[PDB]
Amino acid sequence: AFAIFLIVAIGLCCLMLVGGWFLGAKFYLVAMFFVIFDVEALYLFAWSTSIRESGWVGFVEAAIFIFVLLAGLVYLVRIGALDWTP
Amino acid sequence: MEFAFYICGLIAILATLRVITHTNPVHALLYLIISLLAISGVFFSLGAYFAGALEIIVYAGAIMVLFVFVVMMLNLGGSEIEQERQWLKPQVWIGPAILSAIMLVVIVYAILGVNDQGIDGTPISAKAVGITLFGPYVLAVELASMLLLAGLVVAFHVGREERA
Amino acid sequence: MTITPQNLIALLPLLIVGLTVVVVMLSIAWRRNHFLNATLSVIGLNAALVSLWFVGQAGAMDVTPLMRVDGFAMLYTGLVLLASLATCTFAYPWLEGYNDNKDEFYLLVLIAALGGILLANANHLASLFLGIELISLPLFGLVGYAFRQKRSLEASIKYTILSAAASSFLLFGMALVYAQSGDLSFVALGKNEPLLLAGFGLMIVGLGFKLSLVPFHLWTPDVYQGAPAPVSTFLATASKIAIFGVVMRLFLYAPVGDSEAIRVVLAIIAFASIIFGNLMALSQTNIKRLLGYSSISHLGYLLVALIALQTGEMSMEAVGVYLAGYLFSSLGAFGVVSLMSSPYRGPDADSLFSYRGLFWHRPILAAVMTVMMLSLAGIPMTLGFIGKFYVLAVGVQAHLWWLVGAVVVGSAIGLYYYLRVAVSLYLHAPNWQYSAGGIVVLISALLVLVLGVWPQPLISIVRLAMP
Amino acid sequence: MIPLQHGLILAAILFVLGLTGLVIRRNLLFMLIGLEIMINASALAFVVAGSYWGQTDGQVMYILAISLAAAEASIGLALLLQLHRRRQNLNIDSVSEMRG
Amino acid sequence: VGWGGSLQLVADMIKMFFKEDWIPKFSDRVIFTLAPMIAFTSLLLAFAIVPVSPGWVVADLNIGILFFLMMAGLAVYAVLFAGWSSNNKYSLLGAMRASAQTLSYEVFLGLSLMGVVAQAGSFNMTDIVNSQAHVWNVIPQFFGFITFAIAGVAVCHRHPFDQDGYHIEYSGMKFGLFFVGEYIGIVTISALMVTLFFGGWQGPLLPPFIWFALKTAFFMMMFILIRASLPRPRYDQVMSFGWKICLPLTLINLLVTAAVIL
């Protein structure tokens, strides 16, 4: 299962370590955009898990959620924060 | 899950002692990622399936990437070590710890007063969390979005660009 | 439950303001203009005031389990909206002299209005958290607006670390209560074991930072000196006005607040807030630190009413009218401070020694500061006296003799610094929206005078709102 | 089986360890780290509180708790950018004007 | 040499071993030993959720898709820790730039996969591969398909070129370790592209397990084919045609699927 496979993987990692020692700036803010937008889209991860039974009210709810998110992205692009970057 | 719960809690308890104790910031970042993977093990020990995976995607995988970015672009390694350890004497470290001790033991006494009533391994899947979030908690999601969008405006403003 | 048109009419304040953020953000990305953004933001907040009438057509009802809409929340939404209206009219004259990016200001104030009008409507512990943080993020960022000074950034950073710390105390307390109780809904809570009470004390810590209580008041001087005066109008009035509503509703609904174990602790905090405010407030020669010191004492008088909410039904209207009077007094005073900084001027030079004269410089504006400054104290012919009078009556009604005595001796101590500023505006001397800013503070001066001499119409509004 | 006190004790210890870390250490970076260590400890209490009763009351605002943490962390890192850009010292006593 | 084309890779591995490892002075050691593992082991454990067959799925853990995204997040920590261990400005800014590109194109993969999740209605990978009983999830999510392909080849796969010198500082057994990891990385993206979008375990007339693994190679080879086909773009241009034209695509595709399902 998962635990057996993880134990096997970490044992192989320990074995290859054993074999290895036996043989002998600025404009990062695009990054911060990610950090917002991961948590924004994490609510969408919950919604598509049960789209069917939330139904149209959840659909209208999710439409307004991503419209706010898409309006924020257009603001980011059209300001000039999100462009060519270091 | 009981031994799994215990080992993840002690790893989280210990790695947290390390991150408040250590000096090298990158080692502090590394020990706290150990803490965050330990907490996801705790969530999966308890049964919160949409929290253990959720914490690793975001909390150990989005927020701390931004922390790592700032500590390598300041290039602060090699400066402010000697006087920074001179400030933390063990006699200084003892002082506020007794302050935090008072509330910690009161909480321990307050939580030991109640009965056990041990829960079982109840599995809580994402099938109902997405239902409950967009049902009774419908307002929270939309207003929660504004919390992030507000963070975006202030982070562009305080992270304002210039000629340099 | 699902969405019915009754729920949408009830939610109309949270909706108009949210639609305003979207339109303001689109307008910023389209043109990046100060005039259009100020007009668009003030129109949305005025549209929210108009739509308060439409939710008054709707009765006392729920939207979700998170929120409960009553007539109490109608009045608190109104207080927050006029403060947001007040802060944008005071920000245009200050921001005309700002060098660049002059348009993010209204976007953050609009987010803070969403946060304020979400703590008015509360029924579940989570809505309490979605509201506190929605308003903090603009207050995280707007005290750091114009970070080009050496103290705005200082003030922003001190408030940032401390407000995140309070939110972490509130959240940890919020769960330690929910361990005993099966639900976090205010009503469903309490259905006196130490863990519930211990969880309650943690929420008091996380709430008493933002309400500026006695062991948490240390932020209120520094950021009030550091922040721009337009931000101080919002930070003095709207945040704590909105926050006080949710902390009162928790004790009214929750049966645990009926018990005397929490009551004694909050009374001692209220006792010490009055004393530890009004004694350290004397020595200050800075007007912004002076108003920040008085804020601690005003929130203390609100607490000595709140402790006797559970004894007699007059405490509801007492808290409401003191909040209305406290809004008008602080808006007039902080508007005059901001109106002295008609350009950006870099760091504004405001001090009690810098306010010698000011009657032979600008006579009308000195009269407004004097009227409001006498209204803060307890002098009659001002709305602050009627608010002071109800909190004395509430303390007499509930036999809180030490607490009502603290208000009187706190008033006796606090008369001194209000009167110096009132007379220091009479010593010997050492654009269109600016006229609009003068109109706002002059309108407030007329209101506090006529509602001090003639206070009945404001009581009719308050008893109309209270359930 | 794991009872309430064992889980919540993990939550309480982590909050105290978080809070302690922020107070003792000088650098603003470690103050921000302590904020994250104490916002997850509160969230750890909520999940074990929300999983005691066996419903979806933990994961329904555990996400709001980390949304606050994400927004706080983004602005906190931005504040340290401007702080090192103005002055090369990064301790909080650098911005400590208007004393008393 | 070997008589097989893939067996020459094994030859290279032999030509990779028994080289000594030198410790650079004034450099960290814990990331020096662990930063190889995050590029290797993390995508190796992205193969713990691949149902090659219902009798030979690696792990029947209750949530599949999230455990893919988790690893796809930890993929950025390896690029950073190698750059901080290099301790050279020529490598420092390149590691920052390479990690910025990974963070830029990590956004699209989660939002592209939710459309397939929504039409399947679940995360668990056995529930997916029983949903592909008659029609695979490659007809409806064409936009989700192309964006997941672009997001897969952006993360630790050198398809936009621009890779600087941040892996130069490792040249011993760890160079082969990164190389083994990226080879393992490309087969899991190809396998996951098949078993989540196409149908694994189908077999209309031939053993299904063979019928799937056959498609797996086709994508794996196809990625190599396009790697050698498309030239290098400008590093400014990938961010210009990143968030502008990819983030709206997954969300509008998710709404189209929400209208189709509902």
Author numbering:
A (entry chain A): 15 to 38, 66 to 127
B (entry chain J): 1 to 164
C (entry chain N): 1 to 191, 199 to 437, 447 to 483
D (entry chain K): 1 to 100
E (entry chain H): 52 to 214, 223 to 321
How does the study describe this entry?
Respiratory complex I is a multi-subunit membrane protein complex that reversibly couples NADH oxidation and ubiquinone reduction with proton translocation against transmembrane potential. Complex I from all characterized species contains homologues of 14 core subunits; seven subunits each assemble into peripheral and membrane arms, joined at their tips and form the complex with a characteristic L-shape. The peripheral arm, exposed to the cytoplasm in bacteria or the mitochondrial matrix in eukaryotes, contains binding sites for NADH, ubiquinone, and flavin mononucleotide (FMN) as well as eight or nine iron-sulfur clusters, seven of which connect the NADH and ubiquinone-binding sites enabling rapid electron transfer. Here, we describe the single particle cryo-electron microscopy (cryo-EM) structure of the entire catalytically active E. coli complex I reconstituted into lipid nanodiscs.
After density modification, the resolution of membrane arm improved to 3.7 Å. The model of complete membrane arm, including the previously missing subunit NuoH, was built into the density map with local resolution better than 3.5 Å at the arm center and approximately 4.0 Å at its periphery. An additional density belt corresponding to the lipid nanodisc is clearly visible around the membrane-embedded region. The structure of the membrane arm in the lipid nanodisc is very similar to the crystal structure of the detergent-solubilized membrane arm [RMSD of 1.1 Å (1888 Cα)]. The density for the N-terminus of NuoH (residues 1–52) that includes HTMH1 and a part of HTMH1-TMH2 loop, is completely missing in the reconstructions of the membrane fragment and of the complete complex. The structures visualize a complete chain of charged residues connecting the Q-site with charged residues in antiporter-like subunits. Thus, analysis of the protein translocation pathways indicates that in E. coli, no continuous proton path exists between the Q-site and NuoN. The density of the cytoplasmic half of MTM8 is poor and fragmented between residues 255 and 265, indicating the existence of multiple conformations. Conversely, MTMH8 displays localized disorder next to the π-bulge, indicating possible involvement of this helix in the structural rearrangements associated with proton translocation, and to our knowledge, this represents the first indication of specific conformational changes in antiporter-like subunits.
